[PDB]
Design a protein around this ligand. Structure first.
Ligand SMILES: CC(=O)NC[C@H]1N[C@@H](C)[C@@H](O)[C@@H](O)[C@@H]1O
Ligand SMILES: CC(=O)NC[C@H]1N[C@@H](C)[C@@H](O)[C@@H](O)[C@@H]1O
Ligand SMILES: CC(=O)NC[C@H]1N[C@@H](C)[C@@H](O)[C@@H](O)[C@@H]1O
Ligand SMILES: CC(=O)NC[C@H]1N[C@@H](C)[C@@H](O)[C@@H](O)[C@@H]1O
Lengths: 442, 442, 442, 442
C-alpha cells in the first residue's frame, strides 16, 4: 500500500509499459470541434505571447478567443453563427453522428500507437462521460453518449493502454473574463473551494469508472486542492500500481515530465522519463483552417519521433477529430505513413533505452540519433544519405560488427581518428524508407 | 463566555454530572439494523487487523462489508436479498414499527443508566433526525419520524441526560471503495471541503435542535474542518456550559477520553476522566448471529462496570435495537440484571471517586476494586468468596472500622504484616449478590 | 508517557498538592533590588495605562523606567548614581552579603506558605543561577553564588514545594528601546530565533538542575518558540508528573490561571484552578519609597486570602528582599501576622474546596465567605460582628448543627425566611481573631 | 540545474553506479569504540522495545546506556572506568595510534566492496573531521587527525566510491536525558533552531570538503530544518549529479530506501532501489563482548548478499574498528571469505538486475535466488545440492540452454510439469564454493 504522502508516493516510478511504449495518440475532441476554427499563427514557443491569445492557433481555445471581442475568432463567429449564438450552444450541435470507436482504435493500432488519451474535460468544462457532477456533459447534451467509456472499451479491445486527460487548472464554466495575456493565468481561474472539490470528485469518478493507465492533468491543479492529490494518487496507485501520472499538477509527485511544441523541449538526454506532445498541425483541436503547409510531413513525424525516443521520451501525437466523430484525411494519412515506418523500423524504437549520447551528425550535416537494446545499438539517420561513403563526426566504436538494419547485411567500417567511416552499398541505401538505420553490436 | 480558541476552551472541564453518573447507554440503531447480521469473530484488539474488516464483527459495518465482494456479508446478502439489492434500499425497510421511546427510556432507567446516547448518523451517513442537509434521513425515508428528537424528549422526561453520537470521520455516502485494512482509513474518507462544511453544519444543527449533554464524535474530524471545532465548541459551551465532548475529534480539546473493547483500556488509574464502551456482545449494531456465548453475562457486566469506575471511568454500554425498534431479549435481560445489582450496590458506584489504588487481590486470587466517598472507602470483590476468612494481599488499613456494606454489620479485621485479614460471617457472605462489598471508614 | 502534543498534554491537570496548598510566596529579587526605588502610584488595573510606564509602581521595572528620560526613575538615578552609571552596573552591587536562605524558608513556613517561587530571571535578563547560556548571572557577578540553587535546597529542607519564575516574554538584554505604552509590547520584544532557543534552553536547564514544582512563566513565550512548549511540557511532566505550569505562555495548555492586582480577578467561582498574585505593597521588587500606607494590613491580607480561597484559588503573595538579602521589617511583620491567623484557622483554609457559592453578607453588611471539607462547611466572616444576634442574608441551611469553629461550641440557629439567624455568645466572639469562623455540618 | 523544490528534485534518481555496485562497507567508529562494550541481546526487530534501550546491543549507544543508571553498561563503566569518568573523556583515549587508512581501503577492496560510508558524527555528536562548528571533533581531541579526510583519500585511491554517514536526528551533546523507550524519541531531541542550523551547516561542510557519493542521514532531520533540505539537496546534486541520498530524512525526496536487521526487510521485489544494512555481529560499533556465535558466517553473508541483490538492493555491511584504528580479526576473516566468493561469482552479482521473481526452492527445500544480465539469467542456490538430479519447484524455462556458471559446461534440463529438472554432474557440484550457480540463456 502507498500511503497518502509524498515520501511514500515517491516509491512509485514510471511503469515499464509506459517507458517501453514509445508512441501514444492524444485526442482533443469536444464541442469546440464543431466550429473547428483557429488562425494558424505558428508554434507555441515561437509566437510572441503578447499576441498569442489574440490569434490563438489552438482551436480548442475557441471559447476563450470568442470572449475577446474583436479577435479573429469573434469576427468569424459573428459572421458565421451570429452574436446571439453562445459558445455552449455547440454542445447541442456536437452529435458525433459518424463516430465509430472501433474504427478509431483500429487506426491508432495501425499507426503504431500503444496507448491513447482523450480529453475527458477541456478548459471549456464540457465533460465527455456521464459525470454526476455536471449536466454539461456528452450523455445529456449532444452525442447522448458516454464517449470516454465507449472509446475506452474499444481501445482496450484493440489491446492498447487507455489514459485520460483532464483540465484541472482551467474551467471556463467558472470564470467570465478571458485570458488575454500569460499573466492573466495567475488570477483568472475558478479559485473557489467548490471548484477544488469538483475537480477532485471528477478525477476520482474517472478513476472509479475506467481505472485509466495514465492521469494526464493540464494547467496545474487548483491551489486549494493540491493536498488532495496525496490521497487521490494513493487511492489510484493502490487500485492500479501500473497506472501513472504526468507533471502538470504542480505538486511534489509525478511519474513523467512533459514538453509541448518548443516548450521545455530537451536538447539532450534529460535524465528522467518525459513525453512530447504536439498536434499534427499547430492546433490540438480540429482546425478546418489548416492546410498541409501547417502540418508535419510523415518524414518530419518520423524525425520527431526518433529525436524524442533517443532522448528517452515518448511521443504523444495529437489528433483532432471533427464534430461528427471523423478524423480529417490530412491527419489520417500522416498517421498511416508513420504507422508504415514503424512496421519496418519499430524494433529500433519500442522497448529501447537511451545510449551514451542521443545524437551525432555526418560530415555532410545529416543528423543521427541512437537507441539501445542491450548490446545492440541502433544508429538512425534522419534521412537517407546519397554517397555510399558515410562519415560520422566525433564518434568511434569498439563494436567489431555493424549491420544494415533492414537486410541485416554486415557492413565495413573503421574508426578513422575522431570520426567513424562506414560504407553503405547504394543497394541497401535504396532499400530504406525515410531513415537509413544501422545496428551496431558491442 | 468561552472564546473560540483552545487556550480558552481549556477552561471547560468535564462537568460534575458526567463524572458522578457512572453508567450510560449507547444505542447503535440504523438501517443496518434491518439486515442485523455480522460474523461474530471476536473482540476489537484481539482479532488480527488483516482479517478484521473481512470478517467484521461490528454489524453496523454491514455496508463496508457488503462492498467487499466475497466477504461473509457479501455472500450472505446475495443469498438473502440478491445482488440487485443496494444497501440504501434498507432505509425504506427501516420502519421502527414497534418503537416506543418511553418504553426505551423506562428500561434504561431501570437498568441504572443516567444518560443515553443514540447514533444520530453512523458511517453509512443515514441521519436519524430531520436534518435539512440531506434527504437520506429518517423523516423522509423509512420511520417517517424524527427519531433523535423523540427519543430525546423521552429520555429527558425519564430524568436522564441526553447526548448524541455523530460519525464525523466517516461517511460512506461520500466514498465508494471500502476499507479493507487499517491503512485504508488514512486515505479513504470524504476528503472534500464540501464534506467538512456538511459535518459542521450537521453538528451545529443537532446543537440548535436538541442542545445535547454530550457531543460524541467518532473516527476523528475532517482535517479541513478541525479549525471549525474552536467555533463549534465555543458556541456549544456558551449555550450549554454543562455540555461535554469526547476525545475522538483529533483536536487539542476534549473533556473525557475513550476506550473501546481492548483498545486504549487502562490497566490502572489514568489521571483524567474517561469512558469505556462496548456492546453487550461483539457488535454495536444488532447482530442476529450472536448467541449468549458471545455476550457478557450479568456478572461480567457488573465486573466490567466495577473495574471501570474504580479506574475513574464511566461505562457506556451499548444496546443494538432491531429494525422494528425493539430491544432483543438477550440484551434486555442483561440490562435488567445490571439494573438489579445497581439497586443494591449503587451507593458504592454513583458519585464516587477513585481511591489511592484501584485494585487488589485476595490470597486466593479473587480480584478487588476500590471506590471512595469522602472518608468512606468501598471495597468491591469481583465475586463472593467461600471461606469466612479473607486474606487481602499487599494492603493495610488505618481505619479502625470496617462494615459489611449491605447489612452494615461491623466486621473484625487486622493488618497482619503486609496483608489485611477480615472475617466475613457466611451469613453475610450469603446475603451478597455478585460481589462481596465492604465499606471501610478512616 | 505524555506526548509532545496538546491533545496528550490535556491529560495533565493541576496537581492535588497545588490545589490543596492555598498559599505560596512569590519572591522578586534581583539587581533592581539595589536601587530599590519606584513611584508607588497605585494598583495595577486602577492606574491609567497612558501613565503607567512613565510612573511605574513596579520597582523591578527600574531599567525600563531608567530608559525613559525625564521619568521620576531617571531623575532619581542621575542624582543618586549618575548619568554614567549603567543599569548593568547594579550586578556588581548586588552582593547579598547578609543573605541566609534557611532564615527565608523558615520565615515562609512560619508565615503559613506551602510553596515558594523566586524570580530566576526577570525582564532585565539577569539570572539568579549559574546558567551556561549567559555571563549576566549571579555566579559570575554580584553574589557569586547560585541563589536559585541555595534557595531551592532551603525551601525543600523546610518541607516546602519550590517553583520557578521565568521571564519568557521580555528580556531587556535583547532590546534597547523602553516600553512607554501597552501597544509598544506588541513589537518591542527579542523577536529572534536566537532568543526563542535561549528561553527554551534556559527553562530546560532549570528543569534539569532543579525539577521545579511549578513553571511560572511571565509575559508570554516568544512566538517563534511556541511549538517548543509541547516538547518542553512533555519533558517536564515526564520527569515530574506532579509538576504544574501557569497560563502565561500564549499556548493551548496550562494547569492554572492567574490574576494580578485588579487584572483578571474573578467576582465569583471561575470553574477552573487559578491563583491571585500581588505584592504586599504596590511593587514586586523591593521599593524603599513604600511605607505602611501602601501596604496591606494583616487584616486585609487575611481577608484577601479568604476571598481568593473561597473562590477556588491560591494566593501567591509577593516579597521583595533588599540587595543585601534581607527582608524588610514591614514585610516580615505582615507575613508573621498572617501565619499567626493561619495557625488558628488553617483547618478552614488548607485542603478545602469551594462550596455552592463563595459569598454572602450579614444584615448589616459584614461580608461572608464559604469553604468546604466533605460535609463540613466553613463560614468565614470578614471581621468580627459585635452583636450576638447575627443575620445572614439569602441563606438557608439544611444541617441541624452549626458550631463555633475555635471552641467547637454548638450554637443556636434557625432559618428565618430567605435568611439564616444565629446567636453567637460574646464570650466566643471575643475569642476569634480577625474573622469569626463558624462550622456547619449537613 | 536542479531547483530547490521537491518537484524538481524528483528528477534526480539513484545513480547508475550505486545501482550496479551491490555491496558497500559501513564503518561505525568513534569514541564509543574505546569502551567497545554492549550486551549482545539480539537482532533489531526481534528484541522487544520495552527492553531494547536497557540491554542495547548497539555498542555505539554506549553514552545513552551509560545515562540509564542500573543498566548493564552503567554497572560495567563504573567498575572499569569509574563514576567520575564522563563519556566525553573517551575523546582523549580515542587515539587511533595503529590506524592505517590505506590498509582499510585495501581490505575493503579485497572484500569485494565498491563503496564505503563512515560515521562522520554519530548520536554522541563527536565529529571525525575538523569541522569548524564544534571543538568536539577528532582534529582537536583524540587522534588529532581528520579521519574522514584521510579515509576519503584512501578509499578513492583504492578506486572506491565514498559516502558519508551523518546523525541528523540525534546529537546527545544537545540533550541530557537518555532514551529509555521508543516513545521518548518523540521529544528527547535537540529541538532548537540552533541545532537545525548546525546540522545543515555540518552537512554543507561535508559536501564542500569531500563531495561524498552518498549522503546517508540517520534518525530523521530536525523538523525546523526540513525545508533546508530542498536547498541542500539542490546544492549537492548541482555539484555532484551522480551523488545520492538515502531515505532517513523525513522529507519527500530520497534516492534509495533502507532496511536495518529485521526492520523494513522486503519479502520480495519492492519496486524501488533500497539497501540492507547490519553489523557482522549484533552491533555497529565494535563490541568486545561479541564472539563468533553472535556473528554471521561467511556462508550466511553470501546468502544474505544474494537474497538482497536478487530483491534489487545493495548490502551495506558494517565494520566496527577498535579505538586504536584496527579491525578485529573475526570481522576481517568474514570480509575476506566474502571477497573470495565475490572473486568467483562476482559476475552473477555486480551490475545485475532483478528478474521476474527473486525466488524459488528445490524439491527438498534448497532456497534459490535469481539475478539478470540482459538475456542471461543467473540461478543461485543457497548451498550446494548433494544429488545430481535437481528439482526446482514452480519454474518453467523457455531458454534452450542452461550452463554451469563456473565451468560454462552446458547441462541437461527439461520442464517437467510446474517444475524444472536438471542434472548437474557431481564433478561440477564439487567445484562450486558455497553456492551452486547456473546460468540460463533465453
Ligand atoms: C504548456 C501548457 O500549459 N499547455 C496547456 C495546453 N496543453 C495542450 C496539450 C492543449 O490541451 C491546450 O488546450 C492547453 O491549453
Ligand atoms: C476505535 C474506533 O475508532 N472505533 C470506531 C467504532 N466506534 C464504535 C463505538 C462503533 O460506532 C463502530 O461503528 C465504529 O467504527
Ligand atoms: C499582568 C502581567 O502581564 N503582569 C506582568 C508582571 N508580573 C508580575 C508578577 C511582575 O513580575 C512584573 O514585573 C511583571 O511585569
Ligand atoms: C532503524 C533506525 O532508525 N536505526 C538507527 C540506527 N542506524 C544504525 C546504522 C546505527 O548507526 C545505529 O547507531 C542507529 O541508531
Amino acid at each position: 500500500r502507498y500511503k497518502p504522502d509524498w515520501e511514500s508516493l515517491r516509491e512509485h516510478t514510471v511503469p515499464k509499459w509506459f517507458d517501453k511504449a514509445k508512441f501514444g495518440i492524444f485526442i482533443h475532441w469536444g464541442i469546440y470541434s464543431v466550429p473547428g476554427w483557429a488562425t494558424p499563427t505558428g508554434e507555441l514557443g515561437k509566437v510572441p505571447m503578447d499576441a498569442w491569445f489574440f490569434q490563438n492557433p489552438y482551436a480548442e481555445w475557441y471559447e476563450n478567443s470568442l470572449r475577446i471581442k474583436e479577435s479573429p475568432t469573434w469576427e468569424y463567429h459573428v459572421k458565421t453563427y451570429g452574436e446571439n449564438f453562445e459558445y455552449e450552444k455547440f454542445a447541442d450541435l456536437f452529435t458525433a453522428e459518424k463516430w465509430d470507436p472501433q474504427e478509431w482504435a483500429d487506426l491508432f493500432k495501425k499507426a503504431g500507437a500503444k496507448y491513447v488519451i482523450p480529453t475527458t474535460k477541456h478548459h471549456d468544462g464540457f465533460c465527455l462521460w456521464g459525470t454526476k457532477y455536471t449536466d454539461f456533459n456528452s450523455v445529456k447534451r449532444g452525442p447522448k453518449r458516454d464517449l470516454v467509456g465507449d472509446l475506452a472499451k474499444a481501445v482496450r479491445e484493440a489491446g492498447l493502454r487507455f489514459g485520460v486527460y483532464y483540465s484541472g487548472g482551467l474551467d471556463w464554466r467558472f470564470t467570465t473574463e478571458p485570458i488575454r495575456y500569460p499573466e492573466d493565468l495567475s488570477y483568472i481561474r475558478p479559485n473557489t473551494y467548490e471548484y477544488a472539490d469538483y475537480a477532485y470528485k471528477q478525477v476520482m469518478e474517472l478513476v472509479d469508472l475506467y481505472l485509466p493507465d495514465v492521469l494526464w492533468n493540464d494547467m496545474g491543479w487548483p491551489e486549494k486542492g493540491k493536498e488532495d492529490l496525496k490521497y487521490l494518487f494513493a487511492y489510484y496507485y493502490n487500485k492500479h500500481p501500473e497506472g501513472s501520472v504526468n507533471d502538470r499538477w504542480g505538486v511534489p509527485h509525478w511519474d513523467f515530465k512533459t514538453a509541448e511544441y518548443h516548450v521545455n523541449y530537451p536538447g539532450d538526454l534529460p535524465g528522467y522519463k518525459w513525453e512530447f506532445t504536439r498536434g499534427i498541425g499547430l492546433s490540438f483541436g480540429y482546425n478546418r483552417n489548416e492546410g498541409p503547409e501547417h502540418m508535419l510531413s510523415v518524414e518530419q513525424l518520423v524525425y520527431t519521433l526518433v529525436d524524442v525516443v533517443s532522448k528517452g521520451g515518448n511521443l504523444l501525437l495529437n489528433v483532432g477529430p471533427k464534430g461528427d466523430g471523423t478524423i480529417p484525411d490530412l491527419q489520417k494519412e500522416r498517421l498511416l505513413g508513420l504507422g508504415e515506418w514503424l512496421r519496418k523500423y519499430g524494433d529500433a524504437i519500442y522497448g529501447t533505452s537511451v545510449w551514451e549520447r542521443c545524437c551525432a551528425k555526418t560530415e555532410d550535416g545529416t543528423e543521427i540519433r541512437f537507441t539501445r537494446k542491450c548490446n545492440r545499438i541502433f544508429v538512425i539517420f534522419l534521412g537517407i544519405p546519397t554517397g555510399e561513403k558515410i562519415v560520422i563526426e566525433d564518434l568511434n566504436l569498439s563494436a567489431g560488427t555493424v549491420r544494415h538494419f533492414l537486410t541485416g547485411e554486415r557492413l565495413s567500417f573503421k574508426n578513422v581518428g575522431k570520426n567513424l567511416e562506414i560504407t553503405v552499398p547504394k543497394k541497401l541505401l535504396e532499400t530504406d524508407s525515410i531513415t537509413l538505420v544501422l545496428e551496431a553490436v558491442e
